[PDB]
Design a protein around this ligand. Sequence first.
Ligand SMILES: Nc1nc2c(ncn2[C@@H]2O[C@H](COP(=O)(O)OP(=O)(O)NP(=O)(O)O)[C@@H](O)[C@H]2O)c(=O)[nH]1
Ligand SMILES: [Mg+2]
Length: 162
Amino acid sequence: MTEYKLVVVGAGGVGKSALTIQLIQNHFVDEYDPTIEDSYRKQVVIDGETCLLDILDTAGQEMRDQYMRTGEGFLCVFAINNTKSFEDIHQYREQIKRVKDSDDVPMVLVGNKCDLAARTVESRQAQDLARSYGIPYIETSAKTRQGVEDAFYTLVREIRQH
Ligand SMILES: Nc1nc2c(ncn2[C@@H]2O[C@H](COP(=O)(O)OP(=O)(O)NP(=O)(O)O)[C@@H](O)[C@H]2O)c(=O)[nH]1
Ligand SMILES: [Mg+2]
């Protein structure tokens, strides 16, 4: 079956693992557990297509290039309550394009932790940034599961159109 190699990247503590585990295990992890490198494989049916999602969950701690190279699509995540994680987004995108030798790689910008009230990053500025990159923007919450499937499925569809 079709296998989609997805890579989750972004600053430390934005919720990369929480989003992935919510998608794979149906539960919100409210634990301090920094990631070094973890991979998840799950069979799923998306729009009638039986496929295998091979997800690489990466570390936020500044081996990256190696895994970005094989990745077919990327979820670039930041937290809506951490301005620094939003700014860092640019550095991650630039590194992905340099490693993939392309100006256009399947990508989705993910604004996580939208269940929080203390927002420092307006949805407008994130949407504007996404528009300039030419990629979709989706707000998620690993806690309420809001937008979780949306983020991953949209990335798969982006890969299908590339
Ligand atoms: N309220 C709320 N907390 C979240 C959300 N996603 C993650 N968190 C919390 O944020 C903290 C860090 O999440 P985690 O998934 O470990 O982040 P990471 O980006 O994977 N960290 P690392 O890069 O070190 O591997 C945890 O306490 C987790 O519960 C969310 O949508 N809402
Ligand atoms: Mg993690």
